[PDB]
Structures are given as C-alpha cells and as structure tokens.
Amino acid sequence: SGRGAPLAKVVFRDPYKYRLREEIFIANEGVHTGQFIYAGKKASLNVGNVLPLGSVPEGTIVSNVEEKPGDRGALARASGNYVIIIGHNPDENKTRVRLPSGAKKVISSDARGVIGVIAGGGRVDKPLLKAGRAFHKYRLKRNSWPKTRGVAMNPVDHPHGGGNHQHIGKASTISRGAVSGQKAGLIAARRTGLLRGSQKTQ
Amino acid sequence: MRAKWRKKRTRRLKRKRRKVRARSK
Amino acid sequence: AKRTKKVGITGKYGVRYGSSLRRQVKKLEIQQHARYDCSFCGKKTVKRGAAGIWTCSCCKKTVAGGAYTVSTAAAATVRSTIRRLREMVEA
Amino acid sequence: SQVFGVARIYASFNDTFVHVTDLSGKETIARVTGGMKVKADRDESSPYAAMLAAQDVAAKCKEVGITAVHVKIRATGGTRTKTPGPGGQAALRALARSGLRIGRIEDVTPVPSDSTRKKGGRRGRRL
Amino acid sequence: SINQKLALVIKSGKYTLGYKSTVKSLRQGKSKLIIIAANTPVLRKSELEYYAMLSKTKVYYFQGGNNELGTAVGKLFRVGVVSILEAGDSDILTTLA
Amino acid sequence: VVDPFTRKEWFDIKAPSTFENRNVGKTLVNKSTGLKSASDALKGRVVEVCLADLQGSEDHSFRKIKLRVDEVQGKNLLTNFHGMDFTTDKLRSMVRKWQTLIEANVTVKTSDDYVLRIFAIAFTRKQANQVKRHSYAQSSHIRAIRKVISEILTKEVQGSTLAQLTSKLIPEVINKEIENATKDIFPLQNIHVRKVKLLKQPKFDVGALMAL
Amino acid sequence: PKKRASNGRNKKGRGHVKPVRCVNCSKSIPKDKAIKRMAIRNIVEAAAVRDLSEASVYPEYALPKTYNKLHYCVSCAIHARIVRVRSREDRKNRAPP
RNA sequence: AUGUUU
RNA sequence: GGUGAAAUUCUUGGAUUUAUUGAAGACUAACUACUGCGAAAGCAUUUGCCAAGGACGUUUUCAUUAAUCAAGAACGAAAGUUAGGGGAUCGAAGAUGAUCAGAUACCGUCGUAGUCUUAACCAUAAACUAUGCCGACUAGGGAUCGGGUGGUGUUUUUUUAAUGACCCACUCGGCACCUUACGAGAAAUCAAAGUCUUUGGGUUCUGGGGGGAGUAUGGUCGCAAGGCUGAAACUUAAAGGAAUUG
Ligand SMILES: [K+]
Ligand SMILES: [K+]
Ligand SMILES: [K+]
Ligand SMILES: [K+]
Ligand SMILES: [Mg+2]
Ligand SMILES: [Mg+2]
Ligand SMILES: [Mg+2]
Ligand SMILES: [Mg+2]
Ligand SMILES: [Mg+2]
Ligand SMILES: [Mg+2]
Ligand SMILES: [Mg+2]
Ligand SMILES: [Mg+2]
Ligand SMILES: [Mg+2]
Ligand SMILES: [Mg+2]
Ligand SMILES: [Mg+2]
Ligand SMILES: [Mg+2]
Ligand SMILES: [Mg+2]
Ligand SMILES: [Mg+2]
Ligand SMILES: [Mg+2]
Ligand SMILES: [Mg+2]
Ligand SMILES: [Mg+2]
Ligand SMILES: [Zn+2]
Ligand SMILES: [Zn+2]
C-alpha cells in the first residue's frame, strides 16, 4: 500500500539455525513466483539476483542499490527506476554509477544491488483523471493532499497570503540561508521559467 | 509574386477566415 | 455492433476530463485490462492484479511486470543487455 | 645528433600558429602567431606575418636549446576547411631558413569520418 | 527439417500427444522417441527424461513451446510432449542428433 | 621576465627496448621542487616518433610509433610501446578510386594482459592481364577477406606478448601472412596493419618493464 | 527547356543521393551533382623545396604530399573558375583536359 | 564591400 | 575569434594554441563510380540473428491461374504535431554586431523549437526521367553490374584438377552511354517521345485560352497545421511553349 512497485517475498534458509528467513525485496521486472534468487558475491548475473556492485560488468542495470555496504538498499527503489553501472575503480575499490536523477555517484564496490529494473514502471504515464484517484493515492501515503495555494491564504497563514489580488508580491525564489516560515516557493532556485535546452550539466 | 509566398499568404488568410467563422455562430 | 466510434473503454468517463486525457487513459487501460500469454504454461491467461503484478489464471504463477503491461520496453532491453553481459562474462 | 622539438604549424585562415614544443608536446617553447607580429586584423594570416612569427619562434628555440624540429602542419580541419592557410607555407619556409634543421613534415589536419554537420545552413554562405 | 519429419510422422506413422499418454507409452515400452516442448515445466521434463532413461527411449527437445509443438504436429491445441510409437515412412527416428 | 626555461632541466627519452636504438631525443620539464615533482610531471608523456627514426632505415617512413614514459631513472626516461599509426599522407596515398578498400579491426588481449585494437587495411588490385579498369570486389569476397584478416590478427595477438607483437610489426610479417591467406580470394595489393591502439594496461610491473 | 540531356547531375537509377557540403560556402548539394576535384599538392613547393631539403636532417627525404578531395557547389565552382560555362555543343564533352 | 528608380 | 574590411565575444581568474585523458550525442568521410539494391519515399562502419527479393541455371512442378485497374488498402523525404528519452553539432524563432538611406535581410556571434530515438499522427515535395503500366517489333557500337556456357586461354596451390581473380567469345536480365537517325516532333530533342490522316495490341488516370482559383461553400479525414474533393460571379486577347537575330 502506498508504493508503486510490487514487493517480492523471498524465503532464504538460515545458515546458522534450522529455520526459514523471509525477506521483503522490491520485485524487479521479470521476477516471478517460484523463481530462485541468488544473493551474494558469487551469484550469477541474472535478473533478480543480488550482487555486489563490483562483481557486475560496466553497463549493468541494477536496482535497490546500497549507498554503503550493508544498509540493505537505498537507491533506485521506486517503480521503473534503476541504476546503471558506468565503471569501476578497482584500486581503492569503488564503483561509478548513474542514479535515476542523472547524478553520477561513487559507491563502494562491496555495495549490493539487484539485477534488473524495479517493477511497476510506466505508472506515472497514466493521467490520474480525478481528484478521487489523487485522494486514494495519498490516502495510503500521508496527509499531503489536497494542497491549498499560499496566494489563496491570508498574510497570517503564508508569505504569499493577502493582497487585493492574489499574487506573491516578492520574488518566490527563496535563499538557502532563509529560515523556517520563509522557505515557501522555490527554495535556492538556480533558475526559473520553462526549461529550454539540454539537461545533465557536466 | 512567388507562387509559394502567394500560397503562404492565402493559407494565412484561410486561417483568419476560419478563426472569424469560429468566433461567429 | 460497434457501440462507440472511438472512446472505447473510456466511454465510462462521459464527456469529462478532456479528450486528450481520455485517450491517454484509454491506451493504458486497454493495456492493463488485456490478457497476456503465460511464458510458463503457454496460455493467454495472464491478467493484472495490482500495478506491476501479473498472475496466470492457469498454473497460478505470478510475475512482476509493468504498471499497465506485462513487460515494458525498458525491462526487455535490460533483460537482453544482462543476457549479453552474462554471456560475455562467462565467455 | 641534434635536439628535436615539434614545429606544430596550425595554418588556419585568419591566423597561423607556429607552436614549437618538446617531442612529447606537453612542454611548449615560444608559441608565436601572425597576430602577434602584425596589427592589422587582416594580415594575421598573411605569409609575411607568418614569416616574422616563425623567425621569432626559431630564435627563441635556438636560445632555449632546440636545434631541429619535426614538422606537424595542420589546417582548421574539423568540418571547416581541410586546406592549410596561406601562412603555414611561409612559416615553414622561415623555420627552414632561420637555421633550424627540419625533420618529418606531416599533415595532421583533423579529418572526420563524416561527423558534425557543417555550419552555414543547407544553402551555405550566400555572399 | 524437424517440423517436416514430424508432419510426416503425423501423416503416416503412429503417435500420442500429451503427458499422460506419453508416460503410458514409455512405461509400456512402445515409445521410440519423445519430443518435449521448450516451455515444459522442468519437473515434468525431468520426469519424462527419467522415464526415457528407464525405457531406453530417445528424447528430442523441441525449440518451441507447447503452442509451437501443437502447430508442428498439426493440431489446434497445445501439446507439451509428443510420443512416436511408429515412425511410418518417416526418417525422424534415424536422422537425429 | 621570469624566463621559465631557466628552471627547466632536460631528460633523455631512452624510449624503446627492442626497436633498433635506445636514444630517440630529449624533453625538458620543470625542475623537481617541493610540492611539484618532476617525475610526476613526466611518466605520462607520450612521444610519437617515426619508425624510420627508430630503425635507422627509411623504408619505415610511415608507421609512427607511440612511446609512453613508464619509469624515470636518473636523467633517462624509460618508455614502453603505446600505439602505432600510419602517416596521414601514406594512408591517403593508399586510398585511391577505382578499387575496393577493405578494413578490419579487432579487440584482442595479448598473452600477458595487454588489450589492443588492431586496424588492418587492404586494397583490391588489378591482375597482370586485367583490361577492366576498376577491379572491385564482390563484397562476399570482402566479408571473407575481413574474416580471414580478423582471424589472423586475433591469432597473431593472444599468442604473443606486447614486446613480441612489437617485434612482429616491424618486419610486417602479419601483412605477408594476410597476403598468403587472402591470395585465394582477391589479390589485395596494399595489405597493411594501419593502426594499433592501446585500450587497457596491466599492473605496471617495472620488473618486466626492465627490458631496456 | 532541358539544358542537360541526363540532368545537371549524375543520378540515373537511384532516386536519392546523400548530399555533401561545399568546401567554400558549405551549401548542401547532392554528392553526385557536386563538382569533385582532387588536390595532391606537394607539402612544400613554395619555391622552398631546395630550402627544406638543405635544412632537413634526413638525406633524400622525399617529403610527402597532402591529399584533399574538394566538393564544390555549382555556384562556387563557377565563381572560382573550377568549372567554366561552355558552349551548347561543348557541354557534351565529359573528358577532362 | 555598397550603390534605388526611370 | 570572425570578416571583403570590421564589430559583437573571449582573454595575464591565462583566452587561442600543445599534450594526456574522459563524457555525450549525432554522423558514417576518403573507398564513392554516368556503380548496386528497393514499389516509391529511400538505402553506405563491423558482426550475429530474423524473415524477404530480383536475375540467372533448370529436359522440376501447376496449367491460363493473366494485364491494367473505379471503390477500396499498404508504404510514403523533409518540415510540422502528441508524449517520454536524448539534446554533441547545426539551427526556423529570438537576441545581437556590422552594412545600408532604411536592412529586427544577405555577412558575423550566440541561441529556443527542431535536428536524433521510442510510441503514435500527418500524407505532402521541382514525391522529376516534369516521360503511367503490360505486350510485340524496328539501326549500329562499346563499356559496366548480376547469373550462366565455352576456351590446348593468364596468374594463383593441392599432387592430376577444381574453384579465386583476370583475358577472350557468347548469352539472359539490369543501370546507363555513344553514333545515326529510315522514323517522330513546333523545336529543343527522342531507340522512344518511333512502328500516327497509310490514323485501332490491352488498359488506368489527367487536360480543354489566361486569370479569379486550388479561392468560396458543402462534405470527409486530421489533435492542429492541414490533406482529399471543389465551384460561381466577374475579368481578360492574349497568356504560354520552342527556337532565331540583336
Ligand atoms: K492548490
Ligand atoms: K500576497
Ligand atoms: K584574421
Ligand atoms: K538541442
Ligand atoms: Mg498540485
Ligand atoms: Mg481569502
Ligand atoms: Mg508574514
Ligand atoms: Mg518575503
Ligand atoms: Mg481578494
Ligand atoms: Mg554570388
Ligand atoms: Mg533557362
Ligand atoms: Mg527524390
Ligand atoms: Mg520604363
Ligand atoms: Mg566509411
Ligand atoms: Mg557496389
Ligand atoms: Mg483510388
Ligand atoms: Mg518525416
Ligand atoms: Mg501533388
Ligand atoms: Mg507529377
Ligand atoms: Mg481554362
Ligand atoms: Mg522562351
Ligand atoms: Zn500460466
Ligand atoms: Zn559552395
């Protein structure tokens, strides 16, 4: 509930005690029930397997990636998202990766990831079409909907409130050094207006 | 006049006629 | 007979929400309500549960997929590229 | 039994560069251009300015300790000209007559495998 | 090709279609070859291979699924495994491997 | 007014170990100082010198050789093979109309660890009694010739170290091997190994670097 | 009227030929229509062959040449006199001088 | 390099 | 830098140039041609896979199953549209520098959409050979592409030969070309634009002086831009084609 991507319940055997250990993975696309998932340094490069980032070749597509070895997955967890392995630095062992936002990150080569892309992709391509569907979407996430515009408020309620016309009145780009109660609008905006041209600055 | 530019001017004129006809009802 | 000329499944929305939004919803609704071939038993019995879950009515096998279709093009590309990388690593 | 640099004559239009470097190329010696030796904004590519610049570069190379130069001559290349400018020939001539020894003249103009659609539009410069 | 040989067997020789009849033919020892679809469940595939190992019967692995195997044998229904009882006038049993 | 060449000291590029001759020239670098080491400024320089200079014979006027400085020892830069390339003039001279240009390239690993890309070129030629004026190949001949050349390059590398391949390129025995293996497909007048490109180096291993 | 029997180009049996850009003005002209001239110039003539032979450290260098295939549009070729306007009968003469 | 109309 | 010359712009925060690297996206130079394939639009790095195709060979098979085709379908450059990805370059718009009498034109520097890709539209080009398709026949010639046939042929290795490449001759199909034109045309020119007043091999489509006008209106298709269909009033003695002399 509240998550775009489906979850996979993978049952492992406890290596030190006779019992079963169930894990809640984020299902990668193509993973099916009854499938054998192999997790570890020596696992094969198959979709759904959990491998350290250093053990996979350049160009590999991984998901649920650990920022640090052992944090059990931090990156590329939302539906349809993935991390691209773009290179390795075996001396001072590190892996260069491309994050879903397009940022290039250097991660420890012992950090683990799941081979494949998170399931549920293309979810945001369908128009919600209804306040009701937005209502039920956020009914299981948090009380962040609906959103009243600040310009529609009174000056007491918001920096944008008040005026004989609904207007901001001053620049909506707010400094990063501003304080709580001031950071309404575009916080630390490097630019504004419609984005024209190429992204992914380098 | 160039045939191409006469065609362009006529196309703009039809666009204007369509707009005015849509305005009218 | 053909009950609707073009709206199809999106006739349930009447005249609301805009024609472009209704068409965008129509494509993906057809995709998500279609039946798909089971890769395991070979029957056209795979239907969506929640988004990303695709279950075969016969053989009761469930596969992770796209939100509105069994396999997205990105996932197919990833599968082929991992096949290639695995084959290069093993040989 | 000589000490060899690399001449590196980039003879574009609008300018000529006489850039003698070490054999590796990382360390340079007295890169002088036609615009440094003439101030007219149009004789920068002239053979005379190229000759003066090459003579100055040769004098500085002889003071540094360079006796011979392996010649690498280029045009703008890329997608623009592929034709060496009017000043590169005079620059090489002046390098030859300034007492420096010459070796291994080569054209290193950057030539693509049909990349980088050229500037000017499909109708070109309509002069 | 293999599909042509299989068509010849269906046209002239003797055959059975399906897991149950294939296993019955294997256990009676009147099976000369079993063709197993690519998408056969691996447990069923292993059981058929074990029966074939016990009966000294040849196994051919059809590259297509049950849909393609049914088409190759000329039926409108899925066939997961085919058993050849008599080859008829067909070279399927000898021109393999 | 600082005259930066007054603080620059010269080094001798004792570049090759096996080509013909130790000495290929000199290069100047900033004198070793507190926070900027002269060997640090060196050890990455790639010098491109003609194989004719390296051998002393003028029949190697093309085929410039790259030599990358691997280790610095006492006013002597020890380099190693970094790549080979034809000269632009020679390449353009070989490329002519009314004939078919065939190119092959492979990415192969030398016996020890060196990853190289080898680019070989060849051109169709007329027979002795040919009256037809162009002598083009039928592109199935081109596919076969490319396969033969690629196999020859792939097996010539992977069976030789970097030093062995370097010592094999100078006599151009690979060109003659390609001619022998392709004479039954097309005459192929101008077979050459036009380029060798280094893609990946093994661990430095100054011990086996010490062949010069 | 039709000025040239085939056309002002060389294209019969193709339909489309990829264009090239004029070296002088960068106009896009089909590759077959463009006036193509080869330059095989000596890398040094410059009244300087003797000068650089003397200055060379290599005896009998046999200095190389520069090769450059120039593609001209029709307007640029005519303006630069690479190609000249010929008489009606002389136009049907494809032999170079 | 720029030069309109009759 | 850039130009005819300049200017805008960048530059001792080291621009331009040099070397070693790295990333991105596009493109596929030279080879490249009066060469190839495709129904056309088009298609040019390698290799692998997937189907397809012409020609040739054929003492294989069927036996009229065919040709052209209203309605109807499929594809259809570029530009443009929708939504993602991508966005190096160039670059409608836009901004600027100059020129000019004015010059938000040509020229210079940037630069949005676009250019690329995926999933859908759009369905138009001087979409041209301004030459419908099928069939037969009527001059000569040499090339060239693909296939085949022959040689006491040349070279190449396997050891007999054999393919491979080449030479010679023939041959079928193709892209074209040169000469001549009995012939055709108003001529330019044309091996078809010939076999047409000595007028009939089959068949589809289109035009009927120039404008108004591919306009108005209606229909239909399209998200839109627009496409397809498509007048009339009125006006006019020419408009136009080819060639000749100035
Ligand atoms: K709101
Ligand atoms: K306010
Ligand atoms: K200049
Ligand atoms: K762009
Ligand atoms: Mg909102
Ligand atoms: Mg209020
Ligand atoms: Mg307040
Ligand atoms: Mg405020
Ligand atoms: Mg109010
Ligand atoms: Mg002009
Ligand atoms: Mg004319
Ligand atoms: Mg065309
Ligand atoms: Mg008058
Ligand atoms: Mg190419
Ligand atoms: Mg060809
Ligand atoms: Mg029709
Ligand atoms: Mg298009
Ligand atoms: Mg039309
Ligand atoms: Mg037409
Ligand atoms: Mg009329
Ligand atoms: Mg006229
Ligand atoms: Zn199933
Ligand atoms: Zn031009």
Swiss-Prot record, chain A:
Location within or outside the cell: Cytoplasm
Q: Can you provide one Gene Ontology molecular function annotated for this UniProt record?
A: RNA binding
User: Out of the domains of life, which is the source?
Assistant: Eukaryota
Name the chain's protein.
Large ribosomal subunit protein uL2A
Say where the cross-link Glycyl lysine isopeptide (Lys-Gly) (interchain with G-Cter in ubiquitin) occurs. Answer: K42, K68, K94
Q: Which GO terms describe its biological process?
A: cytoplasmic translation; maintenance of translational fidelity; ribosomal large subunit biogenesis
Species in which this protein is naturally found:
Saccharomyces cerevisiae (strain ATCC 204508 / S288c)
Keyword Ubl conjugation on entry: yes
Which protein family is named in the record? Belongs to the universal ribosomal protein uL2 family.
Q: Name one GO cellular component term.
A: cytosol
Taxonomic lineage per UniProt? Answer: Eukaryota, Fungi, Dikarya, Ascomycota, Saccharomycotina
Subunit relationships: Component of the large ribosomal subunit (LSU). Mature yeast ribosomes consist of a small (40S) and a large (60S) subunit. The 40S small subunit contains 1 molecule of ribosomal RNA (18S rRNA) and 33 different proteins (encoded by 57 genes). The large 60S subunit contains 3 rRNA molecules (25S, 5.8S and 5S rRNA) and 46 different proteins (encoded by 81 genes).
Residues with the Phosphoserine modification? S1, S44, S108, S109, S198
Miscellaneous comment as given in the Swiss-Prot or TrEMBL entry? There are 2 genes for uL2 in yeast.
What are the protein's UniProt keywords?
Answer: Cytoplasm, Isopeptide bond, Phosphoprotein, Ribonucleoprotein, Ribosomal protein, RNA-binding, rRNA-binding, Ubl conjugation
Swiss-Prot record, chain C:
Start and end residues, zinc fingers (C4-type) = 38-59
Q: Which SUPFAM superfamilies match?
A: Zn-binding ribosomal proteins
List the keywords (alphabetical).
Cytoplasm, Metal-binding, Phosphoprotein, Ribonucleoprotein, Ribosomal protein, Zinc, Zinc-finger
Example GO molecular function: zinc ion binding
List of residues that carry Phosphoserine: S39
GO terms under biological process? cytoplasmic translation
Q: Which InterPro entries match?
A: Ribosomal_eL37/eL43, Ribosomal_eL43, Ribosomal_protein_eL43, Ribosomal_zn-bd
One Pfam family here: Ribosomal_L37ae
Its GO CC terms are: cytosol; cytosolic large ribosomal subunit
The signal sequence is none
Q: Where in the cell is it found?
A: Cytoplasm
Q: Which domain of life is it from?
A: Eukaryota
Q: What is this protein's function per UniProt?
A: Component of the ribosome, a large ribonucleoprotein complex responsible for the synthesis of proteins in the cell. The small ribosomal subunit (SSU) binds messenger RNAs (mRNAs) and translates the encoded message by selecting cognate aminoacyl-transfer RNA (tRNA) molecules. The large subunit (LSU) contains the ribosomal catalytic site termed the peptidyl transferase center (PTC), which catalyzes the formation of peptide bonds, thereby polymerizing the amino acids delivered by tRNAs into a polypeptide chain.
The similarity annotation says:
Belongs to the eukaryotic ribosomal protein eL43 family.
Q: What else is known?
A: Present with 44600 molecules/cell in log phase SD medium. There are 2 genes for eL43 in yeast.
Specify the protein name.
Large ribosomal subunit protein eL43A
Q: Which organism is it from?
A: Saccharomyces cerevisiae (strain ATCC 204508 / S288c) (Baker's yeast)
From the broadest rank down, the organism's phylogenetic lineage runs: Eukaryota, Fungi, Dikarya, Ascomycota, Saccharomycotina
From Swiss-Prot, chain E:
Q: Could you provide one GO biological process annotation from this protein's UniProt record?
A: negative regulation of mRNA splicing, via spliceosome
Has keyword Ribosomal protein? Answer: yes
| Keywords noted in UniProt | Cytoplasm, Isopeptide bond, Ribonucleoprotein, Ribosomal protein, Ubl conjugation
- List residues of cross-link (Glycyl lysine isopeptide (Lys-Gly) (interchain with G-Cter in ubiquitin)): K14, K45, K75
- Extract one GO molecular function annotation from the record: structural constituent of ribosome
| Subcellular location(s) of the protein | Cytoplasm
**GO CC annotations on file:** cytoplasm; cytosol; cytosolic large ribosomal subunit
Assembly, in brief, is: Component of the large ribosomal subunit (LSU). Mature yeast ribosomes consist of a small (40S) and a large (60S) subunit. The 40S small subunit contains 1 molecule of ribosomal RNA (18S rRNA) and 33 different proteins (encoded by 57 genes). The large 60S subunit contains 3 rRNA molecules (25S, 5.8S and 5S rRNA) and 46 different proteins (encoded by 81 genes).
Under what name is this protein listed?
Large ribosomal subunit protein eL30
Native species of this protein? Saccharomyces cerevisiae (strain ATCC 204508 / S288c) (Baker's yeast)
From Swiss-Prot, chain F:
Q: What is its main location?
A: cytoplasm
Q: Which GO terms describe its biological process?
A: cytoplasmic translation; maturation of SSU-rRNA from tricistronic rRNA transcript (SSU-rRNA, 5.8S rRNA, LSU-rRNA)
* GO terms for cellular component: 90S preribosome; cytosol; cytosolic small ribosomal subunit
Q: Which GO terms describe its molecular function?
A: structural constituent of ribosome
Please state where this protein is localized. Answer: Cytoplasm
Is Ribonucleoprotein a UniProt keyword of this protein? yes
UniProt subunit comment:
Component of the small ribosomal subunit (SSU). Mature yeast ribosomes consist of a small (40S) and a large (60S) subunit. The 40S small subunit contains 1 molecule of ribosomal RNA (18S rRNA) and 33 different proteins (encoded by 57 genes). The large 60S subunit contains 3 rRNA molecules (25S, 5.8S and 5S rRNA) and 46 different proteins (encoded by 81 genes). eS1 interacts directly with uS11 and eS26, which form part of the mRNA exit tunnel.
Q: What else is known?
A: Present with 92400 molecules/cell in log phase SD medium. There are 2 genes for eS1 in yeast.
**Similarity annotation:** Belongs to the eukaryotic ribosomal protein eS1 family.
Protein name per UniProt: Small ribosomal subunit protein eS1A
